[PDB]
Design a protein around this nucleic acid. Sequence first.
RNA 1: GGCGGUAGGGGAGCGUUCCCGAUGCCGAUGAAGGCCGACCCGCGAGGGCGGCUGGAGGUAAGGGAAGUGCGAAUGCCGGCA
RNA 2: GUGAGGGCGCGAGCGAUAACGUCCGCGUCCGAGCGCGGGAACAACCGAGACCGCCAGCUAAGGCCCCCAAGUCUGGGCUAA
RNA 3: AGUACCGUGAGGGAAAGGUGAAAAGAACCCCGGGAGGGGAGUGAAAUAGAGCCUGAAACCGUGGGCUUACAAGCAGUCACGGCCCCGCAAGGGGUUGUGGCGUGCCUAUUGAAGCAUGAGCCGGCGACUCACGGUCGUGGGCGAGCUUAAGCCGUUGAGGC
Lengths: 117, 52, 101, 154, 112, 137
Amino acid sequence: PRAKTGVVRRRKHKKILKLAKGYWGLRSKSFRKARETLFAAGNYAYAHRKRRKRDFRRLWIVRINAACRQHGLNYSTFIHGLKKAGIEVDRKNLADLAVREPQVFAELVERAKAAQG
Amino acid sequence: AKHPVPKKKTSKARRDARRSHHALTPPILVPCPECKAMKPPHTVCPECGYYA
Amino acid sequence: MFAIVKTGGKQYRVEPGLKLRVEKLDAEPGATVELPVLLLGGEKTVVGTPVVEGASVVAEVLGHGRGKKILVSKFKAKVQYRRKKGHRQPYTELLIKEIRG
Amino acid sequence: RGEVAYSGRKIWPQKHTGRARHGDIGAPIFVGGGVVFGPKPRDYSYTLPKKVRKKGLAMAVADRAREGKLLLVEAFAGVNGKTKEFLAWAKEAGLDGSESVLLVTGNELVRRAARNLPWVVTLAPEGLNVYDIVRTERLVMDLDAWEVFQNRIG
Amino acid sequence: MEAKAIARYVRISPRKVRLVVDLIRGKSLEEARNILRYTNKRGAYFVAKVLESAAANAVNNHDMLEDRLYVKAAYVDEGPALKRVLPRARGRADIIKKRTSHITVILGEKHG
Amino acid sequence: KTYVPKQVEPRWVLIDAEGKTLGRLATKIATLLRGKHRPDWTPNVAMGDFVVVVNADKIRVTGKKLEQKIYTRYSGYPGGLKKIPLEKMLATHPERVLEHAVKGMLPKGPLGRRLFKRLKVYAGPDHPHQAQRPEKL
RNA sequence: GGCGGUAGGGGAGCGUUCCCGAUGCCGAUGAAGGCCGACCCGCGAGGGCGGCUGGAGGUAAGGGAAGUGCGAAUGCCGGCA
RNA sequence: GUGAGGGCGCGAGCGAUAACGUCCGCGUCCGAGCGCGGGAACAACCGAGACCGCCAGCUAAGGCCCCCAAGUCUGGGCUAA
RNA sequence: AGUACCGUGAGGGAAAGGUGAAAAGAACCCCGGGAGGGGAGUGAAAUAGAGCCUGAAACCGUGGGCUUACAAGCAGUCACGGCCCCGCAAGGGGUUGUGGCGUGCCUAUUGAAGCAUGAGCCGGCGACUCACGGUCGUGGGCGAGCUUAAGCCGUUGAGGC
Ligand SMILES: [Mg+2]
Ligand SMILES: [Mg+2]
Ligand SMILES: [Mg+2]
Ligand SMILES: [Mg+2]
Ligand SMILES: [Mg+2]
Ligand SMILES: [Mg+2]
Ligand SMILES: [Mg+2]
Ligand SMILES: [Mg+2]
Ligand SMILES: [Mg+2]
Ligand SMILES: [Mg+2]
Ligand SMILES: [Mg+2]
Ligand SMILES: [Mg+2]
Ligand SMILES: [Mg+2]
Ligand SMILES: [Mg+2]
Ligand SMILES: [Mg+2]
Ligand SMILES: [Mg+2]
Ligand SMILES: [Mg+2]
Ligand SMILES: [Mg+2]
Ligand SMILES: [Mg+2]
Ligand SMILES: [Mg+2]
Ligand SMILES: [Mg+2]
Ligand SMILES: [Mg+2]
Ligand SMILES: [Mg+2]
Ligand SMILES: [Mg+2]
Ligand SMILES: [Mg+2]
Ligand SMILES: [Mg+2]
Ligand SMILES: [Mg+2]
Ligand SMILES: [Mg+2]
Ligand SMILES: [Mg+2]
Ligand SMILES: [Mg+2]
Ligand SMILES: [Mg+2]
Ligand SMILES: [Mg+2]
Ligand SMILES: [Mg+2]
Ligand SMILES: [Mg+2]
Ligand SMILES: [Mg+2]
Ligand SMILES: [Mg+2]
Ligand SMILES: [Mg+2]
Ligand SMILES: [Mg+2]
Ligand SMILES: [Mg+2]
Ligand SMILES: [Mg+2]
Ligand SMILES: [Mg+2]
Ligand SMILES: [Mg+2]
Ligand SMILES: [Mg+2]
Ligand SMILES: [Mg+2]
Ligand SMILES: [Mg+2]
Ligand SMILES: [Mg+2]
Ligand SMILES: [Mg+2]
Ligand SMILES: [Mg+2]
Ligand SMILES: [Mg+2]
Ligand SMILES: [Mg+2]
Ligand SMILES: [Mg+2]
Ligand SMILES: [Mg+2]
Ligand SMILES: [Mg+2]
Ligand SMILES: [Mg+2]
Ligand SMILES: [Mg+2]
Ligand SMILES: [Mg+2]
Ligand SMILES: [Mg+2]
Ligand SMILES: [Mg+2]
Ligand SMILES: [Mg+2]
Ligand SMILES: [Mg+2]
Ligand SMILES: [Mg+2]
Ligand SMILES: [Mg+2]
Ligand SMILES: [Mg+2]
Ligand SMILES: [Mg+2]
Ligand SMILES: [Mg+2]
Ligand SMILES: [Mg+2]
Ligand SMILES: [Mg+2]
Ligand SMILES: [Mg+2]
Ligand SMILES: [Mg+2]
Ligand SMILES: [Mg+2]
Ligand SMILES: [Mg+2]
Ligand SMILES: [Mg+2]
Ligand SMILES: [Mg+2]
Ligand SMILES: [Mg+2]
Ligand SMILES: [Mg+2]
Ligand SMILES: [Mg+2]
Ligand SMILES: [Mg+2]
Ligand SMILES: [Mg+2]
Ligand SMILES: [Mg+2]
Ligand SMILES: [Mg+2]
Ligand SMILES: [Mg+2]
Ligand SMILES: [Mg+2]
Ligand SMILES: [Mg+2]
Ligand SMILES: [Mg+2]
Ligand SMILES: [Mg+2]
Ligand SMILES: [Mg+2]
Ligand SMILES: [Mg+2]
Ligand SMILES: [Mg+2]
Ligand SMILES: [Mg+2]
Ligand SMILES: [Mg+2]
Ligand SMILES: [Mg+2]
Ligand SMILES: [Mg+2]
Ligand SMILES: [Mg+2]
Ligand SMILES: [Mg+2]
Ligand SMILES: [Mg+2]
Ligand SMILES: [Mg+2]
Ligand SMILES: [Mg+2]
Ligand SMILES: [Mg+2]
Ligand SMILES: [Mg+2]
Ligand SMILES: [Mg+2]
Ligand SMILES: [Mg+2]
Ligand SMILES: [Mg+2]
Ligand SMILES: [Mg+2]
Ligand SMILES: [Mg+2]
Ligand SMILES: [Mg+2]
Ligand SMILES: [Mg+2]
Ligand SMILES: [Mg+2]
Ligand SMILES: [Mg+2]
Ligand SMILES: [Mg+2]
Ligand SMILES: [Mg+2]
Ligand SMILES: [Mg+2]
Ligand SMILES: [Mg+2]
Ligand SMILES: [Mg+2]
């Protein structure tokens, strides 16, 4: 019984070569190079997922300290407010209220200023 | 073969790029007073003739 | 009225009636669950003690569902170390209804 | 790479040649070279302990007996080797062709008869063997046969 | 209706004629005849010969009016190479590829 | 799913200059060039204020900076490193000081360049009185 | 409650060739192979479905035996750059 | 399998109270954690042991004037280089 | 095919198989010196048209969609926005503007993106087997026993002695 390669290898290559569609130049036409790229990208994506968090963690903090500044306080001071004033509400994200419903935000600014000191 | 030698296969893009200015241009032709045919300027041509 | 509910370990606001996908939840295929877990309102309701001591949001479990597959794919160089996991994450579809405060 | 038809010479020097490095086309890394641990004729047979061979035959027969398919007979009325005969004969016997029948008998003529049938496998008494037993859904045999079966194990 | 015409196996390099073809693409038939006739390239000869045989077929087989058809499209693909040796100093020997061309020219009715 | 801001409209400002400390002014200034004060802010977009400075010639600076603070500038040529003390800058084109001070505090990408155009520096005061001149401090 | 991992030890699986299964079943209303998918099942290697090609083969469930999986060896043959 | 080890802290010899030097002892990290945050960048220095997912949350070292998250924070001194 | 070719010679030693059920292998006309095309015609099929079944990949080309001439780069990846294409929809597909992040694969090594090795690219060929004997584990048969070798009879995919 001789088991020639047969279809197998082609299929494996093509399977991958699809994954690499769109990649610049020889890096989507040659199996070998595309593969090498995918390795990297796989690791990239997975590392950037963990990042996506950090990025918005920040994006929101800027907005907050932004509109939180208009009423008259540092993000630091403002946080200390709601963290002390019981409101574990507004996961930083939902302090998007600064954009729609500024009044609601403002409510949270005095509530904070107050119980803060 | 000897001393200087290309370090890396020219990219198929970087190649065609070099061929930027390679395209040709149409010959400059004109209708002649003689026949209705076309001549290049300043040139006696068949089906036509000239004058002195 | 805007209404911030917490659930599946994540905060989201909610409009009177609309579809929302949330971390999978233990409930019937088509039942109803309250997210008594709720903060604020569109008529200004600072959530004092973390949660409003009295308020609720009602929603219908429009159905469960998996999610488009992601390829978690580790690769450590010089060390022939490759790993390819497929991962699709479960969830459920809440249709909002009563934001009864 | 020894039995292949090529010669010994070193394809080329192996030093300041720029070419790879080699001995002779025989080398299994050539296309048209020798094969590696490719197959060579070998005896696949072995000696399965006798106790076991019998146990098997007994258990095989039995399995059919316990299934009710086993059916000893002596009444072979359709004699002269002639399929039609055995055909009609099996009709009576309750063998129609809905199930495969391993027929076992001493009489070569009964053999001749059933032989050409595509749902029957003819076989002498000494031929009894698990594979054939197991193959067919239905065992049926001559008394002289069933006897020389008990002879082997009884 | 469109109207094809193809010269296979034309013994000449692709890169070479492709230059001349790309000169007539999307052109008036009469203009092309004019260009090709006077354009200075070995490739003119072949591209012209086919460009013609196309118009021919266009009229005698697909009854388009010679007076209006134009170059709807026209390309040139590479046919099998033609390899020769080329003896070289100190005994090396490069193999010179004499390439070849398939030239297509499709013509179409002037307009509507 | 976080809010992405739409097409806003430039808010021109008008910062003074005289008296203000070089560094400390620049700081504020850039945070306007980037929108980072406006809550509706977003990195990828670029929508900070059109800052306009006047009388930059009257920028103050602590210590011997007028003498010590030298700028470098390397022409591609050999020995082409040409240095220049703060004095000389303020003497000649002065806004130049305030300009780079800010430039050096803007992000290094393309929009960082785009952001630089947003800044109009002078010494007069008096700019081209476009429209908005909302004074600030 | 544990779960980074090279050399290495252990375990479970996927796929190629061939055999029993087979005097069978799939198959021109379309076999193998090729091309294509944003679908379905599998953690995965894979498996399935659908359209296009292709024109005659293919081979379950459960087992069995191996010339059984390639990116590299200045590897070998060919094609093209 | 391994029998080239490497750096760092400490304790000695050698060395010149030289060396990304060497040679032992104890420990440690890299090796195999060139995975993640800090140190501009940087195996082994500080922080921490990555099963996968999350546009949640607290903190570690480090850091909070702008590039760059977060105080141009409060109070008392010193320094003019 | 021991041929072509290589070697003075002993001697080395290739590549190269497939239309179609049938030749029905394309009369005749058309452009062309011819080759080769277009039409006509044969055929179930002619992208079966003659080194002609299938016809993959690298590689070359025409057309279309998106994008690019103030930009800094292991070519990805994460986010957002534009444009084009699917779809009742919500969604989805293609492209890439800006923003964040990011030192190729293998090998060898105390340590490599490494200015250390290997690889132009693609396709196919390519490396832990087998026999006997050992040793342990393992699924069975029998057990103070267990088992047969060569061979003989039988069979021609039958076992038995
Ligand atoms: Mg193989
Ligand atoms: Mg598939
Ligand atoms: Mg992409
Ligand atoms: Mg990589
Ligand atoms: Mg945070
Ligand atoms: Mg607003
Ligand atoms: Mg509103
Ligand atoms: Mg030009
Ligand atoms: Mg005259
Ligand atoms: Mg309550
Ligand atoms: Mg790496
Ligand atoms: Mg290694
Ligand atoms: Mg490496
Ligand atoms: Mg490896
Ligand atoms: Mg109410
Ligand atoms: Mg020979
Ligand atoms: Mg020989
Ligand atoms: Mg030999
Ligand atoms: Mg010899
Ligand atoms: Mg040598
Ligand atoms: Mg070489
Ligand atoms: Mg060799
Ligand atoms: Mg040898
Ligand atoms: Mg050969
Ligand atoms: Mg051969
Ligand atoms: Mg051979
Ligand atoms: Mg019974
Ligand atoms: Mg029945
Ligand atoms: Mg000419
Ligand atoms: Mg006409
Ligand atoms: Mg062309
Ligand atoms: Mg010469
Ligand atoms: Mg060449
Ligand atoms: Mg003033
Ligand atoms: Mg002075
Ligand atoms: Mg100098
Ligand atoms: Mg000078
Ligand atoms: Mg002015
Ligand atoms: Mg668990
Ligand atoms: Mg593990
Ligand atoms: Mg195992
Ligand atoms: Mg075979
Ligand atoms: Mg059928
Ligand atoms: Mg049908
Ligand atoms: Mg097959
Ligand atoms: Mg087969
Ligand atoms: Mg299919
Ligand atoms: Mg099977
Ligand atoms: Mg092998
Ligand atoms: Mg390998
Ligand atoms: Mg190779
Ligand atoms: Mg070659
Ligand atoms: Mg080659
Ligand atoms: Mg070449
Ligand atoms: Mg040692
Ligand atoms: Mg040591
Ligand atoms: Mg050690
Ligand atoms: Mg040590
Ligand atoms: Mg030292
Ligand atoms: Mg360790
Ligand atoms: Mg690092
Ligand atoms: Mg350092
Ligand atoms: Mg390390
Ligand atoms: Mg480190
Ligand atoms: Mg906190
Ligand atoms: Mg702290
Ligand atoms: Mg701290
Ligand atoms: Mg102080
Ligand atoms: Mg002080
Ligand atoms: Mg021959
Ligand atoms: Mg021959
Ligand atoms: Mg010959
Ligand atoms: Mg000769
Ligand atoms: Mg000779
Ligand atoms: Mg050959
Ligand atoms: Mg031949
Ligand atoms: Mg004939
Ligand atoms: Mg013809
Ligand atoms: Mg005629
Ligand atoms: Mg003629
Ligand atoms: Mg003629
Ligand atoms: Mg012809
Ligand atoms: Mg002809
Ligand atoms: Mg025709
Ligand atoms: Mg017909
Ligand atoms: Mg038909
Ligand atoms: Mg066909
Ligand atoms: Mg041919
Ligand atoms: Mg055929
Ligand atoms: Mg194009
Ligand atoms: Mg184009
Ligand atoms: Mg399109
Ligand atoms: Mg276009
Ligand atoms: Mg760029
Ligand atoms: Mg990017
Ligand atoms: Mg559309
Ligand atoms: Mg539809
Ligand atoms: Mg709807
Ligand atoms: Mg699309
Ligand atoms: Mg890093
Ligand atoms: Mg080495
Ligand atoms: Mg070394
Ligand atoms: Mg090692
Ligand atoms: Mg390099
Ligand atoms: Mg070297
Ligand atoms: Mg290298
Ligand atoms: Mg070496
Ligand atoms: Mg290597
Ligand atoms: Mg090299
Ligand atoms: Mg070469
Ligand atoms: Mg290959
Ligand atoms: Mg036992
Ligand atoms: Mg025999």
